[PDB]
Design an enzyme around this catalytic site. Structure first.
Site, PDB file in Angstrom:
ATOM      1  CG  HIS A  45      -0.468   0.379   2.494  1.00  0.00           C
ATOM      2  ND1 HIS A  45      -0.234  -0.518   3.523  1.00  0.00           N
ATOM      3  CD2 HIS A  45      -0.208   1.610   2.988  1.00  0.00           C
ATOM      4  CE1 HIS A  45       0.178   0.167   4.588  1.00  0.00           C
ATOM      5  NE2 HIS A  45       0.200   1.460   4.286  1.00  0.00           N
ATOM      6  CG  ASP A  93      -0.084  -3.878   2.754  1.00  0.00           C
ATOM      7  OD1 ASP A  93       0.507  -3.440   1.724  1.00  0.00           O
ATOM      8  OD2 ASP A  93      -0.466  -3.186   3.732  1.00  0.00           O
ATOM      9  N   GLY A 186       2.814   6.326   8.600  1.00  0.00           N
ATOM     10  CA  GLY A 186       4.175   6.554   8.291  1.00  0.00           C
ATOM     11  C   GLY A 186       5.107   5.452   8.756  1.00  0.00           C
ATOM     12  CB  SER A 188       2.657   1.770   6.299  1.00  0.00           C
ATOM     13  OG  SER A 188       1.393   1.856   6.964  1.00  0.00           O
ATOM     14  N   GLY A 189       4.995  -0.425   6.121  1.00  0.00           N
ATOM     15  CA  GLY A 189       6.066  -0.921   5.309  1.00  0.00           C
ATOM     16  C   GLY A 189       7.307  -1.291   6.057  1.00  0.00           C
TER      17      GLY A 189
END
Ligand SMILES: [Ca+2]
Length: 240
Positions: A45, A93, A186, A188-189
């Site tokens: 995402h 994801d 922020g 995320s990932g």
């Protein structure tokens, strides 16, 4: 990260900052994990938008010269083929980014170690989330890399009605939910680092928090379970 502490600069050398070009500058949007000298693992995402992305390795402070950064363009983006941006709850994801150059390794820049395929952590296993995400619900990004201790919440508990219910899948890891500490926008990932047999490995890729807020009790931060995607990762890297 809500309820974090500032990480030591050499604790989490596989953490990267994924940034996009905005005007004459660059803005942090997501975390990631350096997995090869030229590959980063992040959340699908994070790369939904059609932006110009770069990766910063050796980053500690988004807003100051650390003296350790390497800035590298993203050359290729490989999103999991089953990802659907309007169905984060379905999973998948995850994305891999091939970098334009191979970064140089040092105490600030190291490959993240991934778990063996299939590994599932016992309930309440010790982990840290890291990132520059918001420090409060509806707050602002951190300047310095943050860490928070977020123990895992196993699938049986995490998928129970007072937690995430059906929204959590076995291809995810849940962690935290204490109402104090969490991931936030922020983060995320980026990684969830879990200590097993004396070594930290990246068991999670931060995926989502509650729409109600980041640090919501019984809404642990939800991560893509890296150990479900080992073959996928290896196949992408081998084919690119
Ligand atoms: Ca910096």
């Amino acid at each position: 990260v809500v309820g974090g502490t500032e990480a030591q600069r050499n604790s989490w050398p596989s953490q990267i900052s994924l940034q996009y070009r905005s005007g004459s500058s660059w803005a942090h949007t997501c975390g990631g994990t350096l997995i090869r000298q030229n590959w980063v693992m992040t959340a699908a995402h994070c790369v939904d938008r059609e932006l110009t992305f770069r990766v910063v390795v050796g980053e500690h402070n988004l807003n100051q010269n650390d003296g350790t950064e390497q800035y590298v363009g993203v050359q290729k983006i490989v999103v999991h083929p089953y990802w659907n941006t309007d169905d984060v709850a379905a999973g998948y994801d995850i994305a891999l980014l091939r970098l334009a150059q191979s970064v140089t390794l040092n105490s600030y820049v190291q490959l993240g170690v991934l778990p063996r395929a299939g590994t599932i952590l016992a309930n309440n296993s010790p982990c840290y989330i890291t990132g520059w995400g918001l420090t409060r619900t509806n707050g602002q990004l951190a300047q310095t890399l943050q860490q928070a201790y977020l123990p895992t919440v196993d699938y049986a508990i995490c998928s129970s009605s007072s937690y995430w219910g059906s929204t959590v899948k076995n291809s995810m890891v849940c962690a935290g939910g204490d109402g104090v500490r969490s991931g936030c926008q922020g983060d995320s990932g980026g990684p969830l680092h879990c200590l097993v047999n004396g070594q930290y490995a990246v068991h999670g890729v931060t995926s989502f928090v509650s729409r109600l807020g980041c640090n919501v009790t019984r809404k642990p931060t939800v991560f893509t379970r890296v150990s479900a995607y080992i073959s996928w990762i290896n196949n992408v890297i081998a084919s690119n």
